[PDB]
Amino acid sequence: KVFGRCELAAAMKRHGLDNYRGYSLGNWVCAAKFESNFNTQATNRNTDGSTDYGILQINSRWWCNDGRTPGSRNLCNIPCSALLSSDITASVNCAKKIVSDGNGMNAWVAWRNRCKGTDVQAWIRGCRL
Numbered sequence: 001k002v003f004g005r006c007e008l009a010a011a012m013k014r015h016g017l018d019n020y021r022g023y024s025l026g027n028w029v030c031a032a033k034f035e036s037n038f039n040t041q042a043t044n045r046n047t048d049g050s051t052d053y054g055i056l057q058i059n060s061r062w063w064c065n066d067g068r069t070p071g072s073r074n075l076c077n078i079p080c081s082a083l084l085s086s087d088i089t090a091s092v093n094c095a096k097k098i099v100s101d102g103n104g105m106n107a108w109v110a111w112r113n114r115c116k117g118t119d120v121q122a123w124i125r126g127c128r129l
């Protein structure tokens with residue numbers, strides 16, 4: 001599923017991400033745009049052999065099991081394929097664990113390079129929330 005901007009903002013708010021660990025909703029929408037272009041089916045391969053999955057590009061080296069990343073962890077205890085669903089519950093629940101692990105949203109490279117320090121509130125302008 002390819003979400004609309006305000007459609008995704010409303011889904012993330014319903015799942016408890018607005019101000020989760022101090023990160024306003026615009027931060028999460030901005031990260032999703034630049035990680036995946038709002039596409040739940042996005043996948044990308046890393047140099048080390050791991051793969052990033054879903055709307056928030058969660059990495060199989062640490063967070064999910066895809067059966068082909070040897071010596072990796074599965075800290076969210078889920079198959080990586082679950083992160084590609086049109087239902088974002090699994091991606092959101094895992095993201096809550098990631099952002100609590102010490103580095104906040106710096107775990108998302110595109111957030112650090114394209115969202116951090118910008119006016120992220122603009123990503124939710126005009127949305128009925």
Ligand SMILES: CC(=O)N[C@@H]1[C@@H](O)[C@H](O[C@@H]2O[C@H](CO)[C@@H](O[C@@H]3O[C@H](CO)[C@@H](O)[C@H](O)[C@H]3NC(C)=O)[C@H](O)[C@H]2NC(C)=O)[C@@H](CO)O[C@H]1O
Binds near residue numbers: 101102103107108
């Ligand atoms: C969205 C996504 O998958 N991002 C990936 C990053 O999570 C990943 O960064 C590394 O993540 C792990 C786990 O969060 C980091 O380990 C943690 O580091 C903190 C700070 O030192 C420490 O408090 C935690 O104890 C420690 N947890 C564990 C289980 O070890 C690790 O430091 C991160 N590494 C770097 C260079 O930032 C990166 C790198 O694999 O990939 C992203 O895609």
Ligand SMILES: [Cl-]
Binds near residue numbers: 120124
């Ligand atoms: Cl915001």
Ligand SMILES: [Cl-]
Binds near residue numbers: 088089
């Ligand atoms: Cl959903």
Ligand SMILES: [Cl-]
Binds near residue numbers: 022103104
């Ligand atoms: Cl933080």
Ligand code: NA
Binds near residue numbers: 060063069072073
């Ligand atoms: Na893994």
